[PDB]
C-alpha cells in the first residue's frame, strides 16, 4: 500500500526516462517476428501500457535492450512510436505462466 508504492511508482518513471531518451538513440539491429504479441496486465512491463503489440511476420527496429525482460524499439510503421519489446526468454516465460 504505502510502503510498496514508493519504489513501484518511480521504477516506471525511471524506465520512462529510459524510454524518453531512447527515441533519439540509434537503431542497433532489427528482427523478424515469427509470432505475435499483445501486452497484458500480467506481462509486468516496467511502464504499463506503453509497450507495443504486433502480429505475425512483423519487423521490429530494436533501438536497445531495456532489461532482461524487455527491449526498447518500435514497430516499423508510419506514425508508430517507441515502446517495449519482450525478449524471447520473457516470451518463453509468458508461455509457462499460462500453463501453471
Amino acid at each position: 500500500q504505502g510502503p510498496h508504492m514508493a519504489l513501484r511508482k518511480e521504477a516506471e518513471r525511471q524506465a520512462l526516462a529510459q524510454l524518453e531518451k531512447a527515441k533519439t538513440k540509434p537503431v542497433a539491429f532489427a528482427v523478424r517476428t515469427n509470432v505475435g504479441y499483445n501486452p497484458s496486465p500480467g506481462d509486468e512491463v516496467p511502464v504499463e501500457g506503453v509497450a507495443i503489440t504486433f502480429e505475425p511476420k512483423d519487423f521490429l527496429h530494436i533501438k536497445e535492450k531495456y532489461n532482461n525482460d524487455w527491449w526498447i524499439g518500435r514497430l516499423v510503421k508510419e506514425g508508430c512510436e517507441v515502446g517495449f519489446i519482450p525478449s524471447p526468454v520473457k516470451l518463453d516465460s509468458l508461455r509457462l505462466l499460462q500453463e501453471q
Binding site: 537503431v27 539491429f29 532489427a30 528482427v31 523478424r32 517476428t33 515469427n34 509470432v35 519487423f59 521490429l60 527496429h61 524471447p88 516470451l91
Partner: peptide, 12 residues
Amino acid sequence: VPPYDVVPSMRP
C-alpha cells in the same frame, strides 16, 4: 521456432 530472426535495419 524462435520469435526473433536478425534482419538488416533497411530491407534491400
